[PDB]
Structures are given as C-alpha cells and as structure tokens.
Amino acid sequence: NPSYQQSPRHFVPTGMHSLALGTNLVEPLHALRLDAAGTTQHPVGCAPDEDMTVSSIASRYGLIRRVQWKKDHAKGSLLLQLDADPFVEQRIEGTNPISLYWFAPVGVVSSMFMQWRGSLEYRFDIIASQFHTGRLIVGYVPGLTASLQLQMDYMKLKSSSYVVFDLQESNSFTFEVPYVSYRPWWVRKYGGNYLPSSTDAPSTLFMYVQVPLIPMEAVSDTIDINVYVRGGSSFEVCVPVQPSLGLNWNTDFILRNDEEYRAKTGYAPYYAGVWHSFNNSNSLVFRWGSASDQIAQWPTISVPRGELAFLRIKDGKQAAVGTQPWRTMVVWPSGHGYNIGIPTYNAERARQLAQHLYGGGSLTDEKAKQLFVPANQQGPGKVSNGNPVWEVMRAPL
Amino acid sequence: NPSYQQSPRHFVPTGMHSLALGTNLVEPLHALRLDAAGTTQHPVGCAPDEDMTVSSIASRYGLIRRVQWKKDHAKGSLLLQLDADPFVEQRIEGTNPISLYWFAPVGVVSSMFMQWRGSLEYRFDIIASQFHTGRLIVGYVPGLTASLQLQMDYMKLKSSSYVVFDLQESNSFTFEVPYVSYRPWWVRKYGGNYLPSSTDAPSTLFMYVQVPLIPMEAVSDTIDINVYVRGGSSFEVCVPVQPSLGLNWNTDFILRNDEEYRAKTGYAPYYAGVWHSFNNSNSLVFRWGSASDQIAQWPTISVPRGELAFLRIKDGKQAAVGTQPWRTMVVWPSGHGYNIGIPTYNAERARQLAQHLYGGGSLTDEKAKQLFVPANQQGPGKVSNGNPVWEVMRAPL
Amino acid sequence: MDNPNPGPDGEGEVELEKDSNVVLTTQRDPSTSIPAPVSVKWSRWTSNDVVDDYATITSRWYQIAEFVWSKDDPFDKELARLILPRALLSSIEANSDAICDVPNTIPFKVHAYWRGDMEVRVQINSNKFQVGQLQATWYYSDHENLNISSKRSVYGFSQMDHALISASASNEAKLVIPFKHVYPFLPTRIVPDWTTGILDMGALNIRVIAPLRMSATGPTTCNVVVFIKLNNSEFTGTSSGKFYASQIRA
C-alpha cells in the first residue's frame, strides 16, 4: 500500500530532559503505575493541609533571641544589636566541631534563594507584670558597615527610622523592619558552599533602653525579652540556588583528605600552659613540655585574602584540659620563629581573635589580649590524647 | 490496549542546530531557568535605550581627520585626500608592533559585512572666527586607481561631482559623498584575515583650497579643520562575514611558530650605520660591525605576488638606537650577495618603500632614496639588545 | 532680518535659567547633549522609608569646577575629568570647606542613598578672536571600564553623545544627564557593599579638539565654569552624620 516518499522529518538528539525545569511543561516518562491516567487523589480525610508557599513559611514567627532586661540597665544602654536580615542566627551550645544553629521559618528560606528584597518584622514578647514600666527603642539604620556597627549610641539611632515602646499593662509589640537598599534584591549573607561569594547584610536593628525599668518591691527587677522573627508584609524571594543550610540528621563530615589540622610531628601531647614570651605568662598557650621554650609548633595555614582561620577539635574527649576542654584555638606566628597554638574559651572568642589578627593587627594589642585565656584557667593541666585532630574553620572578614 | 501497527515515521539524523541561523525560527534548547515561560522583561527603569540597528550606528558622527589650514596655503593646494569608503582609518601613535587605528561608527560596521553600496557624508567642522574667510573644494571622483590618485589637481576635480564652500560667519558644512560604482554593492577594502581577498575603495574625495585664507592681524593664520564621517542618507550593508577589525582589550599576538623574523645567525648585535655601497654612505643601514663590509645579512622573505613586506620589532626596548628607536625596517637584496636591513623612520615610510621596491623598482631610484633614513640620524649608535624579534608585515600593492 | 541696533545698551538677547533661587545666564543658546531617557522613580522599589527629595535646596546651581584654557594646551589634553555625582561634594570638601556648610549637599550628609537626574552647564567666556574648540562628553560608568584610556581620547568621545564648544562665539554646552547606573540607587558613603567608589554614577570630561589659535600678541588665557543642577532626585535612607564620608581625592 502507497509509499510516503516525501522527505522525512529532521530532528536533533538530546539525551535527557530535564534537571530543570518544572513550572509549566508536560514531562513524559515511564510511570510504574498500572494506568496511564494514574494520578493520586486526595480524599476528604487525606486533606491537603498546606498551602506550600514561600510566603506560607515566611509568616510563622520563630524565636531567635532572649534578652534579660534589668533595672540596673542604664539610661544609655543596648539590649541586642542583631542583624536585620533573614539570615539571623542563634547558636546552640555544643558540642562537635561544626556548631548547630537555630533559624526561623524565614531563615530556612531564603537559605535556598540568592536574593530576597523583602520587608521584615520582629515581635518583641516582653514578659512583664503590670507593675513593670519601661521604654525600649528599635531602629533600622541602613548602611551599617563593619567598624561602624559600633560607635553607635541610642541617640544616633533616633536619627534613622526608629520606634519607642511604652509598657505598663501591655507586654509585647511588633516592629516591622524597613528595607533600605541601593539594590532591588539582596544577595545571600551566607553563601554556601563558597567563602568569598557572600555579601554582608544591608543593615541592622538595635533595641536600646530608652528608659530604665522601675520595678516595685514585690515583682523582680530582671525580666526576659523573648524575640521572634518572620517575613513582614512583603518579604520577597528571588532565585533558587545552592542552600546555605544543611541537615540536622547526620551532623558529620568525613575530613578530607586527610588534611586534618594537627601539631607538627614531635609536639605531642600538649597541655595549655603559660610562657614568658606570650603576654608575659599572663595567658594560656599550648606547650609540649614544661621546660625552657617548649612551645607547640603548629603548621602554617595558607588563607586567601578576605578570610580568617581558627581551630575546633573533632573529639572533646581528646582535647587538652584546664578548667574546661580547650576545644577551640587560634594559630598565629610567635616571632620566636614558629606558630603557636593559643587556646580560646569558645569558637566566638577564636573567631573574634581571627577578626583582629587577620584584620592586620598584632599580638601585643589590648584588643587581642582580652581574648587570650587567663593563666588561672590552666587547671590541673591535663595533657591531650596525643595529637588529636583539629579542623580549620574559615570565614570572611 | 489497541496496537498502533501502522508504519512508524521516517526521520533523518542530524547532530546540532544551529550555528546559523537566527532571523525568524524557533530554537528549542535546554533553558536553565526554573520556568518554561521564562523570558526576561524590561521594566520602566530598565528601559531598552537603543534601537540596535546597523543604521542606528552608521548615523553617529565620529572624528577621523584634523587638517591645519594656513594662509600660506597656495591658491593651488590640497588639504586631505582621504578615501571615500567606510573603511577610512586614522593611525594612532605607538607603540607595539601592530598599530592601533581609529574608526567611526560607520567604520566598525561594515567591518562585519562583505558589501555596503551606500551613500556617505562628511562633516567638515571648521573652527574659525568671523574674521577668517576662505573657500574649500570637495569632490567625489569615481575611478581613482593607484597611480591615478596623484596626477590630480583641484581643477580636474572640478570635473566630477564637486562642491565649494564659502566661510565668513558660518564655520562648518556637510558634504554628502555620492556612490558611483559599476557594482551594486561594494566588497571590503580590508579583508581579514586574508591578504589577496581584499579589493580597493571605489573612489575618494579631496579637500583642496579653492581660495587661500585671509586673516586679519588679530586672529591667527593657521586654523584646524576637524573632519567627521558617518553613513549618509542610505548607507546600506549587505552580508555578514569575518570581521576585519579586532579587539582593543588584549592587543597581543603569540608569534607562531616560532617564525619570528630576525637576522641570520652571527649578525648580532646590530646598530644603524652607513655604507659606501648603500647610497654612497648617505643613508642608514644595519651593520653588525664597524669594519669593512660588515653589513647585517637578513633572511630572504618569500612574498606572493600582489603583496609587499617590511618589519616592525616586538619590543622597542630592544631596538637599535640613533636619534630614535629604529622599530621599523625594510628588507631587500643588496647586490653584493645578500639582503640588507634598512631602518625607516616609521611604519608608513617602511610600507611606502615596499610599495616602490615590490612595485618593480630599484634601490638607486630617487623615489626610494627619499625614504631611506639620513646618516645624521645615526645618533650615539647604540647596538641592539642582541638579535631581537621582528615580525613580517604584509599588504597588497 | 539683520538690522544692527546697539543702543546705549548694546543690543542682544540673554536667556536665563532660574530655576530655584539662583539665576545664571547665557548670551548664546547651548549645544545640548542628551545621552539617555529621563529616569523613572525607583524609590517605590529599592527602599521603603522616607521617600522624598529636596526642591528649592538641592535643585539649585552650585559651582564645582573652573579652569584655564591656553595656547599651550596641545591637541588632546583634558582640562577636567570630573566625576559627576560626587565632585559636587568633592570640590567643596577640598575647598577647605565642609559638605554640611552648603545647601546643595546637606541631604547627602544625612541621607544614605540617592537617585536623580543631573543638569550641567559648561559656560565659558572666550573672545571672538580666539579660534579653538572643546568637547564636553559623558560616560555612564567610566571607572568600571578597564582600558578606558583607550576611550579617553577626543576621537573616542566624538563617537558618542557629547556637546561642542568653540572658542570664538563663546558659547555653552548644555548637558542633561539622567540617572543610569547598574543599581537604581547610589550610596552616599560606605555601605555594607560599595566600600569604595562611593557615590559615582560616571565622570564628565572636557578635552580639546582645537587649541586656542591666537594671533601675534592676542589674548593668551581663557577660562571655563562648570555648574550643576540636581533635579528630579530622591534621598531615601536617613542616617546620622557621623556615618558620613568625605569624598576621595582629585
């Protein structure tokens, strides 16, 4: 029967569709259901509750801070200076190297997006009797750079969009955080996984004490200020990219490869002690012996400009011991021809030291020497469990 | 369920569409956007300014020449004889081998096209007081071959389409360049990258001094004539081909392979000097010594008929030195059984010499010997930095 | 029509440009140069705060530059290459004066971000016996380009939107420059980003296309005045003045 001899169709081979996209297009595949019209229905009992919207999430109010307000708080005093951006953290204590963090529903997103451009808000739940009275400030001042984040009083805050709250028989209030930028949308503050590919927050709000609290003798003077954060009337979200937040399921990291940071061969074990050449024996530094100038020599850490470095041990059950396990430390040259391991209280105090040494500083400055651990913390002076693994943390500065 | 047993479709495999074309056809691909209806919009602020037309570009007036007009200019005198075609250059001074060039918006296109067929125009901005008076000519004479470009007075120009301009209190004027050809469209004057695949311009305009200038004692006698060029009322453009113009970003060229032109093994270093056998010691030629007949012997350059060759050094910080770095030179046989390196003032004077030696000429002609560098330019006579790299330039003749 | 009638008042018209508590005149209509469309207001986009500009105060005409034009100046020698947001402030700050002192800058002191079209006059008093030519040209982002020295040339800017000034019959270059940056706003000082290149929307630059061609013993020197109007603005972003930034050098 008849020959279709007219020229056949043309066609250009691809291999697979489609790791993107999925907004509006029909995706053909091989369904393992028995039917070609097999789409699951949702019965009256199997009710579709949500409402799976980026907005739906960025509207729940998640806790993020808790400030203790006291009568002792001066007329001129601040309570929190937390960042006005969705990527506002809350560190949770312990214990493994990488520290876990609390994040509002407006934190988990846009952890998935690049830009946001939104308006936000903070609910300040002030647990208070009717016999507690005070006044709090709160001001979104755009253009808060690094150094300029200090040099900040409650008076210059009154220069930008700010609010004062009177509390007698009305506990909480909600401040909507304005969005002042030169840029339409706002890129990630935390960019994962990439160090220099992360731009700071557009601004921050503070909560000063406009008027100190006056508590009558039958109600306590200290009071908790719980703080919640959610996307405001128009927190927008722009473009899906690599998430900046991880699981909570398996908080492990197989240390490649095997570039585990640990003391130079021969400097083990090592306890926290003192040294006449390190702040005149007034602060703790790792020593591999009790004799003359036996200070633990540590490998040099090659860090690219615009970053900082410190150390957190893998197992706390192998760290050197004083009054507490020195799980955190900072590494910097000692001038006597090597690098020394300087134990810190916690990761924050190790970071802050890296913010000052990599910020083009010295060791004999008062700003750094107030982050060094005092020598009365040396404790029983237990040595480590050999030369346990430390991992090198990284952060922009 | 039922069997579609009728004969399947036919089809002819290709691999890829489509390095051309893109006028009117739908191009299917794999878009990395999240949506299948993702086409970027242009907001009121993100306004689409241009108007991206070949015409839009060939309508802006770009500078191309500057003539100094003086009272001393005779009744019979020319000011510029620049070419009447979009590929009209303006050499910019220095410094590396390949010289950079200025080109009007009507120059950059049709540097992308093969043919143009258009009408053009020149704005002659004459910066002048009201106390300066003169008359200029301008004539598009089609059919201007090589030799016939000279033998050209302001009188025979008055034979073709020509214009005379009176200037008292009216400085500038605009002459629209006619287009007289046998060919509908006009192929490239500069064909890149291919030497013999480039046909000269259809004609040229001149700007003679019909009446010399008469300047009263309180205004200067010399006056600048700035010249601009743009596509006229109907500069057309025909067919996209390989661009004849390059970047300006990275003006380098990795010299293949490694056929760098340099003196024969043993003739280094070499300074510019004189020779009794080269214009009776009246002109500069490269010497590898101060003794009898020590003239730098240079490799023979195999040039195909219809072309010419000269030399420009890579680094001026390695050239032989007289009053100036002899960065340019021409190579031709010396009759005494080898080829000699004859330094020139600049690239133009090296080309013009190649226009006369490859134009079937000799060395003992006055036309060539007025392009040879005088012997009082020999200077302190610094030798080169060894035998530095020269590269062989090529041009049709 | 050409009857000359110069009475006790030598006759001739004088067009004026007031416009906000300052009146500046020009006895010769200008050669305008409009590089872009008028900019829309993107305050109701980037920032939700005090959304306003300042009329009678920042929409005036302050002087930012003035310089010399002489026969010595060779062909292509820029007399100025002044940045445009920017040198309105940077001129006054290096005048041993403060930004706070002048009315056409004060909101830049307080307010963090700025957007607005610009107006510029390049007025000069040259004599009818001087035969030269200048060209004022605009570039919406000069510092961002790497090899713009390539562009930094009289030839290059003739290729684009510019104004022309000839010494004789002096003459003014009107120069309406609307806002067109990459981001719709500009930062008045250091900011969570823009840690440098503070308040820079592009630079103006005046080079020479024809030197002052002077007769024997004719008048040597000349002079230019650069004026600037900041109309159609918007200053959202209230910030204390201790956060301010005294602009960088010339």
Indicate the SS3 state at residue C246: coil
Q: Do residues A142 and C239 make contact, with C-beta atoms less than 8 angstroms apart?
A: yes
Token pair 């004599």 is at which residue? C127
Residue A356 lies in a domain: yes
Separation between Cα atoms, residue C241 and residue A133, nearest integer Å? 32
The set of residues, in sequence order, having a beta carbon less than 8 Å from that of B373 and lying 6+ positions away, is B272, B283, B284, B322, B326, B342, B343, B344, B345
Whether omega before C59 lies within 30 degrees of 0, making that bond cis, reads: no
| Number of neighbouring beta carbons within 10 Å of residue C141 | 15
Indicate the SS3 state at residue A281: helix
Is B222–C154 a contact, with Cβ atoms under 8 angstroms apart? no
Q: Do residues C131 and C213 make contact, with C-beta atoms less than 8 angstroms apart?
A: yes
| Number of neighbouring beta carbons within 10 Å of residue A354 | 25
Is C185–A183 a contact, with Cβ atoms under 8 angstroms apart? yes
The answer on B246 and B358 residing in a single domain is no
Q: Do residues B354 and B310 make contact, with C-beta atoms less than 8 angstroms apart?
A: yes
Is A21–B14 a contact, with Cβ atoms under 8 angstroms apart? no
Across the interface, which of A141, A143, A183 has its CB nearest the CB of C46?
A183
Separation between Cα atoms, residue A108 and residue A88, nearest integer Å? 10
Q: Residue ranges of the alpha helices (H) in chain A? A: 54-57, 105-108, 154-157, 347-357, 366-369
The answer on B66 and B205 residing in a single domain is yes
Q: Do residues B113 and B106 make contact, with C-beta atoms less than 8 angstroms apart?
A: no
In Å, how far is B48's CA from the nearest CA of chain A?
18
B34 CB neighbours in chain A (<8 A) are: 20-23, 240
- CB burial string B313-324: b at 16+ within 10 A, e below: bbebebbbbbee
| Burial class, C18, CB count within 10 angstroms (exposed 0-12 / middle 13-18 / buried 19+) | exposed
Across the interface, which of C158, C166, C218 has its CB nearest the CB of B63?
C158
Nearest of B302, B303, B299, B295 to residue B389 by alpha carbon: B299
Give whole-number Cα distances, A157 to A68, A150, A151, B49, B238, in Å.
21, 12, 11, 41, 65
Taking the C-alpha atoms of B143, B146, B152 and B157 in order, what is their torsion angle to the nearest 10 degrees?
20
A143 CB neighbours in chain C (<8 A) are: 112-113, 187, 189-192, 237, 239, 243
Nearest of C144, C147, C153 to residue C181 by alpha carbon: C144
Q: Do residues A222 and A68 make contact, with C-beta atoms less than 8 angstroms apart?
A: yes
Is C49–A141 a contact, with Cβ atoms under 8 angstroms apart? no
| Structure tokens that stand for A363 in this block | 């060791």
Domain range spanning residue B184? 53-252
Q: Which of B189, B218, B252 is the last residue of a domain?
A: B252
Separation between Cα atoms, residue A225 and residue A126, nearest integer Å? 5
| Burial class, B7, CB count within 10 angstroms (exposed 0-12 / middle 13-18 / buried 19+) | exposed
Across the interface, which of B105, B127, B130 has its CB nearest the CB of C132?
B127
Indicate the SS3 state at residue B311: strand
Q: State which H helix or E strand residue B108 sits in.
A: helix B105-108
Across the interface, which of B16, B28, B36 has its CB nearest the CB of A21?
B36
Domain count of chain B?
2
The answer on A356 and A208 residing in a single domain is no
In Å, how far is B179's CA from the nearest CA of chain C?
24
Residue B2 lies in a domain: no
Indicate the SS3 state at residue B285: strand
Q: Which of B200, B234, B252 is the last residue of a domain?
A: B252
The answer on A257 and A240 residing in a single domain is no
- CB burial string B103-112: b at 16+ within 10 A, e below: bbbbbbbbbb
Token pair 């101060």 is at which residue? B290
Beta strands in C50-151 (DSSP E): 62-67, 113-114, 119-124, 133-139
The answer on B159 and B140 residing in a single domain is yes
The answer on A242 and A328 residing in a single domain is no
Separation between Cα atoms, residue C131 and residue C70, nearest integer Å? 11
A145 CB neighbours in chain C (<8 A) are: 190-192, 195
Residue A130 lies in a domain: yes
The set of residues, in sequence order, having a beta carbon less than 8 Å from that of C56 and lying 6+ positions away, is C20, C21
Separation between Cα atoms, residue B109 and residue B54, nearest integer Å? 7
| Burial class, A170, CB count within 10 angstroms (exposed 0-12 / middle 13-18 / buried 19+) | exposed
Q: Residue ranges of the alpha helices (H) in A67-176? A: 105-108, 154-157
Q: Could you tell me which chain A residue has the CA closest to the CA of B32?
A: A20
| Number of neighbouring beta carbons within 10 Å of residue A307 | 14
Give residue A356's Cα distance to chain centre.
19
Residue B17 lies in a domain: no
Give whole-number Cα distances, B239 to A200, B116, B181, in Å.
50, 8, 18
Resolution in A: 3.8
| Structure tokens that stand for B133 in this block | 């008076």
Is A9–B11 a contact, with Cβ atoms under 8 angstroms apart? yes
Whether omega before C146 lies within 30 degrees of 0, making that bond cis, reads: no
| Number of neighbouring beta carbons within 10 Å of residue B115 | 17
B352 φ, ψ (degrees, to nearest 5): -60, -35
| Structure tokens that stand for B190 in this block | 């500069």
C213 CB neighbours in chain B (<8 A) are: 127, 219-220, 222-224
Q: Could you tell me which chain A residue has the CA closest to the CA of B14?
A: A12
The answer on B185 and B68 residing in a single domain is yes
Residue C221 DSSP symbol? -
Nearest of C6, C172, C213 to residue B129 by alpha carbon: C213
Q: Could you tell me which chain A residue has the CA closest to the CA of B13?
A: A11
Q: Could you tell me which chain B residue has the CA closest to the CA of C43?
A: B45
Q: Which of B252, B286, B302 is the last residue of a domain?
A: B252
Neighbours of B, requiring at least 3 CB pairs below 8 Å, are A, C
C46 CB neighbours in chain A (<8 A) are: 180-184
Residue B24 lies in a domain: no
- B199–chain C Cβ distance below 8 A for any pair: no
Separation between Cα atoms, residue B60 and residue B123, nearest integer Å? 11
A4 CB neighbours in chain B (<8 A) are: 7, 10
Residue B23 lies in a domain: no
Indicate the SS3 state at residue A336: coil
Interface probe for A, chosen from C44, C47, C111, C114 (most Cβ of A below 10 Å), is C47
Residue A48 lies in a domain: no
The answer on A184 and A279 residing in a single domain is no
- A196–chain C Cβ distance below 8 A for any pair: no
The set of residues, in sequence order, having a beta carbon less than 8 Å from that of C180 and lying 6+ positions away, is C35, C36, C39, C140, C201
- C219–chain B Cβ distance below 8 A for any pair: no
Indicate the SS3 state at residue B115: coil
Separation between Cα atoms, residue A29 and residue A13, nearest integer Å? 17
List all residues of chain C from 49 to 88 with a beta carbon under 8 Å from chain B: 75
The answer on B247 and B193 residing in a single domain is yes
The answer on B376 and B241 residing in a single domain is no
Q: Could you tell me which chain A residue has the CA closest to the CA of C187?
A: A182
Give whole-number Cα distances, B381 to A214, B267, B385, in Å.
95, 16, 13
Separation between Cα atoms, residue A286 and residue A322, nearest integer Å? 11
Residue A34 lies in a domain: no
- C183–chain A Cβ distance below 8 A for any pair: yes
Separation between Cα atoms, residue A340 and residue A357, nearest integer Å? 13
The answer on B360 and B224 residing in a single domain is no
The answer on B353 and B313 residing in a single domain is yes
Separation between Cα atoms, residue A19 and residue A383, nearest integer Å? 53
The full DSSP string for C103-126 is TTTHHHHHBSEEB--BEEEEEE--
Residue C49, amino acid: D
Q: Do residues C228 and A183 make contact, with C-beta atoms less than 8 angstroms apart?
A: no
| Burial class, A109, CB count within 10 angstroms (exposed 0-12 / middle 13-18 / buried 19+) | buried
Interface probe for A, chosen from C196, C238, C242, C244 (most Cβ of A below 10 Å), is C238
